[PDB]
Design an enzyme around this catalytic site. Structure first.
Site, PDB file in Angstrom:
ATOM      1  N   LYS A  18       0.824  -1.204   0.000  1.00  0.00           N
ATOM      2  CA  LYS A  18       0.000   0.000   0.000  1.00  0.00           C
ATOM      3  C   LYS A  18       0.861   1.258   0.000  1.00  0.00           C
ATOM      4  CE  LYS A  18      -4.229   0.081   1.692  1.00  0.00           C
ATOM      5  NZ  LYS A  18      -3.795   1.492   1.496  1.00  0.00           N
ATOM      6  N   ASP A 131      -8.918  -8.787  11.927  1.00  0.00           N
ATOM      7  CA  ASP A 131      -9.651  -9.356  10.785  1.00  0.00           C
ATOM      8  C   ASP A 131      -8.750 -10.035   9.732  1.00  0.00           C
ATOM      9  OD1 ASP A 131      -9.715  -7.095   8.220  1.00  0.00           O
ATOM     10  OD2 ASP A 131      -9.252  -6.274  10.212  1.00  0.00           O
TER      11      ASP A 131
END
Ligand SMILES: C=Nc1ncc(F)c(-c2cccnc2Oc2ccc(NC(=O)c3ccccc3Nc3ccccc3)cc2)n1
Length: 246
Positions: A18, A131
């Protein structure tokens, strides 16, 4: 142990994101073939996560497991930061899940076992997880699955901080298993509001082709109250799992 960018021979761009870019790489010294992420500190600052990374690289480095993406080492120049990572040759579970739309009762159970195995280790080595997504799941050579994530007036509900954080991964495991079996996540909807609705009220429904062992497991993982979801161990010892894992 003392890494520099010219210790490495560079291959093909492996995708971006990213903050940095990943390239394929090889150790000039050991000819060992590995991935290399290139983060820019400038891009970390305008996102305020420089210390957050350094913090996590120290945590990550002490995690050796077949089912967790191995970080080998790290280094930096003034502008750039580098992470030496296990190359997962067979792509992501995202790409594959798009190729196959959904997975077979055994492909799913094996993947759950592996995740469960990896998550148990983290719990054991004291490192809890948030998550997991298909996009964050990479694939090794022998089809193996790789997690690639990255006073006196104070009341009791503020000094005990976060009570049940261990139990999130069991929800994740529930959700994942479903998507693997169905092709879509269990509370996927049109509005964000209708998704929020179905997540809150725990509103999911198995299409007819889903087996009982799966429905049973999935239901047990997807409990509203965190402290009711099975501990990882139990998932490994579930009739459906212990009948398709290899
Ligand atoms: C096709 N296979 C394959 N194999 C290995 C790969 F790394 C990739 C890949 C290619 C392009 C983009 N991402 C890829 O996968 C990952 C997945 C996770 C990571 N992990 C990290 O970047 C990371 C690891 C340890 C500590 C920190 C990390 N990142 C991080 C950055 C900022 C803040 C906090 C953590 C790196 C690359 N792809």
């Amino acid at each position: 142990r003392q890494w520099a960018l010219e210790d490495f021979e560079i291959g093909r761009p492996l995708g971006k994101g990213k903050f940095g870019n990943v390239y394929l790489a090889r150790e000039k010294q050991s000819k060992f073939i590995l991935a290399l992420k290139v983060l820019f500190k400038a891009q970390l600052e305008k996102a305020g996560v420089e210390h957050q990374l350094r913090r996590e690289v120290e945590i990550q480095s002490h995690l050796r497991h077949p089912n967790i993406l191995r970080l080998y080492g790290y280094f930096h120049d003034a502008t750039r930061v580098y992470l030496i990572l296990e190359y997962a040759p067979l792509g992501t579970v995202y790409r594959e899940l798009q190729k196959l739309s959904k997975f077979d009762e055994q492909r799913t159970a094996t993947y759950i076992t592996e995740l469960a195995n990896a998550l148990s280790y983290c719990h054991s080595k004291r490192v809890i997880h948030r998550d997991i997504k298909p996009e964050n799941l990479l694939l090794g050579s022998a089809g193996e699955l790789k997690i690639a994530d990255f006073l006196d007036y104070l009341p009791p509900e503020m000094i005990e901080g976060r009570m049940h954080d261990e139990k999130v991964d069991l929800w994740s495991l529930g959700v994942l298993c479903y998507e693997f079996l169905v092709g879509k996540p269990p509370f996927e909807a049109n509005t964000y509001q209708e998704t929020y609705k179905r997540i809150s009220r725990v509103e999911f429904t198995f299409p007819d082709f889903v087996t009982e062992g799966a429905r049973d497991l999935i239901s047990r993982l997807l409990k509203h109250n965190p402290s009711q979801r099975p501990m990882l161990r139990e998932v490994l010892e579930h009739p459906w799992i212990t009948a398709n894992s290899s």
